């Protein structure tokens, strides 16, 4: 039970973007860098073009998806509106549509509160059907693969291996073989979902996992179960 989760996860995949740490996707005067999993979490045509391989109103569309908010005027309404036509964007093209009725001549900053949620679901469904995910993490025989924008979104240990100039490349990352699998798996799950799933049985491995993984937040909260 962590309801900030998807909300600091958001704001970490925001500021990835804007020092263009893991993104493998950029859009032209104006260059826009972006992460393909987190345009597929937010459109379906992103996520159709990018598992299978310039437009004035982009700008807003992409900051929308990073911040939850949406920024229109008079100016670029049509502009906002055809894009996100285009790419399917429900959200947008209705805020797009409330902007129009008022009419014109008013500006609108609008802020989505359930975005970031809807965006770490997605991210989790991408995760379960082994879409865009670009890392497999080798924890002792087991195989997990996730996205390497989430993982150094949460974990400080991630953050370090993805900006390390000999391993930022690689497509599989080895974790000690002491690390408990399932421990991992714990982690890694609550990562996409903000569901720490905690068992008697699982608690130690769980919370050095998360000490090894630089999680101090679930780290506390291991220790408040042991304690309640």
């Known amino acids: 039970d962590f309801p900030q989760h998807s909300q600091h996860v958001l704001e970490q995949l925001n500021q990835q973007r ?37 437009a004035a109103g982009l700008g807003q569309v992409l900051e929308f998806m990073y911040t939850a908010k949406l920024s229109l005027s ?14 399917q964007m429900q959200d947008i093209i209705t805020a797009c549509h409330a902007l129009k009725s008022l009419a014109g001549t008013a500006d609108s900053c609008i802020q989505f509160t359930r975005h970031a949620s809807d965006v770490l679901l997605n991210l989790n469904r991408l995760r379960s059907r082994d879409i865009l995910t670009d890392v497999v993490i080798v924890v002792s025989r087991e195989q997990f693969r996730a996205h390497k924008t989430v993982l150094m ?46 068992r008697e049985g699982n608690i130690m491995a769980v919370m050095a996992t998360a000490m090894y993984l630089q999680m101090e937040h679930v780290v506390d909260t291991c220790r408040k179960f042991i304690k309640a």
Do not use: W
């Open 18 to 54: 804007q020092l263009g740490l893991l993104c493998d996707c950029t859009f032209v005067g104006v260059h826009f860098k972006a992460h393909k999993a987190v345009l597929a979490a937010c459109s379906e045509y992103f996520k159709m073009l990018f598992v299978d391989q310039n």
């Open 74 to 87: 008079p100016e670029n309404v049509d502009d906002v509106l055809a894009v996100a036509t285009f790419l």
């Open 153 to 198: 979104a949460c974990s400080g240990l991630f953050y370090s291996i993805f900006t390390d100039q000999l391993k930022c490349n690689l497509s599989v990352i080895n974790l000690d073989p002491e690390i408990n699998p399932e421990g991992f798996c714990i982690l890694l799950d609550f990562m996409y979902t903000s569901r720490l799933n905690l």
